[PDB]
Scaffold this active site. Structure first.
Site, PDB file in Angstrom:
ATOM      1  N   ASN A 189      -1.970   1.871 -14.465  1.00 48.12           N
ATOM      2  CA  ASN A 189      -1.114   0.955 -13.729  1.00 48.12           C
ATOM      3  C   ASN A 189       0.312   1.389 -13.887  1.00 48.12           C
ATOM      4  OD1 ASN A 189       0.362  -2.086 -14.084  1.00 48.12           O
ATOM      5  ND2 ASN A 189      -0.059  -1.185 -12.146  1.00 48.12           N
ATOM      6  N   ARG A 245     -12.746 -17.390 -13.385  1.00 45.60           N
ATOM      7  CA  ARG A 245     -12.203 -16.041 -13.232  1.00 45.60           C
ATOM      8  C   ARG A 245     -13.200 -15.051 -13.824  1.00 45.60           C
ATOM      9  NH1 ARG A 245      -7.101 -16.502 -14.289  1.00 45.60           N
ATOM     10  NH2 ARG A 245      -6.491 -14.322 -13.789  1.00 45.60           N
ATOM     11  N   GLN A 295      10.988   2.915  -5.587  1.00 44.26           N
ATOM     12  CA  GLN A 295       9.814   3.074  -4.736  1.00 44.26           C
ATOM     13  C   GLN A 295       9.436   4.525  -4.541  1.00 44.26           C
ATOM     14  OE1 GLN A 295       8.538   1.164  -0.600  1.00 44.26           O
ATOM     15  NE2 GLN A 295       9.279   3.256  -0.829  1.00 44.26           N
ATOM     16  N   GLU A 329       8.148   6.127  -7.758  1.00 48.61           N
ATOM     17  CA  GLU A 329       6.758   5.773  -7.964  1.00 48.61           C
ATOM     18  C   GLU A 329       5.858   6.721  -7.181  1.00 48.61           C
ATOM     19  OE1 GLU A 329       6.712   1.414  -6.899  1.00 48.61           O
ATOM     20  OE2 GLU A 329       6.705   1.261  -9.041  1.00 48.61           O
ATOM     21  N   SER A 349       7.363   3.382 -14.932  1.00 50.16           N
ATOM     22  CA  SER A 349       6.594   3.779 -16.099  1.00 50.16           C
ATOM     23  C   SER A 349       5.141   3.716 -15.703  1.00 50.16           C
ATOM     24  CB  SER A 349       6.785   2.834 -17.327  1.00 50.16           C
ATOM     25  OG  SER A 349       5.984   1.636 -17.487  1.00 50.16           O
ATOM     26  N   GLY A 393       0.793  -1.200   0.000  1.00 49.50           N
ATOM     27  CA  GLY A 393       0.000   0.000   0.000  1.00 49.50           C
ATOM     28  C   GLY A 393       0.827   1.251   0.000  1.00 49.50           C
ATOM     29  N   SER A 394       2.158   1.208  -0.012  1.00 45.29           N
ATOM     30  CA  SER A 394       2.987   2.402   0.030  1.00 45.29           C
ATOM     31  C   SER A 394       2.596   3.416  -1.037  1.00 45.29           C
ATOM     32  CB  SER A 394       4.458   2.026  -0.167  1.00 45.29           C
ATOM     33  OG  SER A 394       4.879   1.793  -1.517  1.00 45.29           O
ATOM     34  N   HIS A 404       4.694   0.449 -13.372  1.00 44.55           N
ATOM     35  CA  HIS A 404       5.690  -0.607 -13.317  1.00 44.55           C
ATOM     36  C   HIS A 404       6.940  -0.082 -12.632  1.00 44.55           C
ATOM     37  CE1 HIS A 404       3.213  -3.170 -15.558  1.00 44.55           C
ATOM     38  NE2 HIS A 404       3.697  -2.955 -16.772  1.00 44.55           N
ATOM     39  N   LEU A 446      -5.297  -9.711 -15.813  1.00 47.67           N
ATOM     40  CA  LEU A 446      -6.521  -9.041 -16.228  1.00 47.67           C
ATOM     41  C   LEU A 446      -7.299  -9.674 -17.385  1.00 47.67           C
ATOM     42  CD1 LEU A 446      -4.952  -5.639 -15.591  1.00 47.67           C
ATOM     43  CD2 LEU A 446      -7.028  -6.679 -14.444  1.00 47.67           C
ATOM     44  N   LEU A 462      -2.809  -8.171 -21.693  1.00 46.81           N
ATOM     45  CA  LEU A 462      -1.409  -8.479 -21.415  1.00 46.81           C
ATOM     46  C   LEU A 462      -0.710  -7.280 -20.769  1.00 46.81           C
ATOM     47  CD1 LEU A 462      -1.631  -9.870 -24.832  1.00 46.81           C
ATOM     48  CD2 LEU A 462      -0.230 -11.284 -23.435  1.00 46.81           C
ATOM     49  N   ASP A 463      -1.395  -6.231 -20.300  1.00 42.74           N
ATOM     50  CA  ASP A 463      -0.809  -5.061 -19.624  1.00 42.74           C
ATOM     51  C   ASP A 463       0.052  -4.176 -20.518  1.00 42.74           C
ATOM     52  OD1 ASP A 463       0.599  -3.211 -17.609  1.00 42.74           O
ATOM     53  OD2 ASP A 463       0.048  -4.618 -16.119  1.00 42.74           O
TER      54      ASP A 463
END
Lengths: 193, 191
Positions: free
Chosen positions: A106, A64, A154, A157, A119, A11-12, A108, A92, A127-128
């Site tokens: 999202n 799923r 980190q 981000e 990114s 959760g950072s 990375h 996904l 496939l993200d």
């Protein structure tokens, strides 16, 4: 801005989103947080900030598809203008991504010898993949540990994932025709430079 | 037994049922813990336990109908054999109560009509069949709170047992009567 986060762990990240909303950097609010792991510490950060949480666990569903149906059900319940993925370890489906596509974000630990950095991008397929909005790079110096590297990333981000959501917040970002567009101008596959 | 628990606070009774499930007293599993309070500690308990949580809030919905439709929906997702109401402080709708009826159980701090009672919950003026009572002897000098603490404790002993009983399929409810071992238990529960 109705921000819903998905997580699978610490959760950072979720956190800096949350703060930026309390500091009105992001002009939005995190309405719910969903996790797919029950012991995800990020759940705790949510509870601490009084954000509602839901945890769907695949074992609890028998396809799923059923899992996604339910997830898309509970998410829409909060009427999200943005659905942020801040470390959701999950493969996904087509249907999920489509359903959100344009609002789905999202991040990375990577940019898409070895250089490092993050990114942030519009998810566009199962496939993200999709338009980078912003890539940032992290130096490695002589003799840092894997942990020092990991921290730097980190940190990075925490510095940009917020910010890209502010651009979406003030309507400066929009993805269309599979390209991310900030301020009218279409961005090259490296993102804003 | 698939046990779903609804809570709003510290969930010490939850905790208790968690433990009773580990230790095989209660033959079943706490599938998830629902709450209507987002800072409800009892959630953090269930985190440790590795049990899925769901916060549903008043505000996030526009109507009670709305709320209870969804709640009922996220509970029945887990196919509950028992919906346990430990400290779920919300005014239970007619349809909620009629939905889990017969496997919806609640604990209350006073002997019914100090001490606890665990009763099935129904559309009955009294409140529903009482299954087990437990009194806590108070003496003068006992402040409100060691009274409170003495009861807390007692809950934690009985509710696990009542649920365990439910879970091994002895405890039943029909005709607004709680039955145990096929024979009608009386008004103050099992003595």
């Amino acid at each position: 801005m109705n921000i819903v986060v998905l997580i699978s762990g610490n959760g950072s990240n979720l956190q800096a989103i949350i703060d930026a909303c309390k500091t009105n950097k992001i002009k939005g609010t995190v309405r719910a947080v969903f996790s797919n792991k029950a012991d995800a510490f990020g759940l705790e950060r949510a509870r601490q900030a009084g954000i509602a949480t839901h945890t769907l666990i695949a074992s609890a569903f028998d396809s799923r598809e059923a899992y996604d149906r339910e997830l898309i059900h509970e998410i829409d319940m909060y009427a999200p203008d943005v659905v942020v993925l801040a470390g959701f370890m999950r493969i996904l489906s087509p249907a999920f991504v489509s359903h959100y596509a344009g609002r789905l974000l999202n991040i990375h630990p990577s940019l898409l010898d070895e250089e490092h950095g993050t990114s942030v991008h519009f998810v566009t397929d199962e496939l993200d993949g999709g338009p980078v909005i912003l890539q940032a790079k992290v130096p490695v110096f002589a003799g840092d540990s894997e942990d020092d590297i990991t921290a730097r990333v980190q940190t990075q981000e925490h510095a940009i994932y917020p910010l890209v959501i502010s651009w979406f917040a003030d309507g400066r970002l929009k993805m269309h025709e599979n390209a991310a567009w900030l301020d009218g101008q279409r961005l090259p596959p490296q993102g804003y430079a």
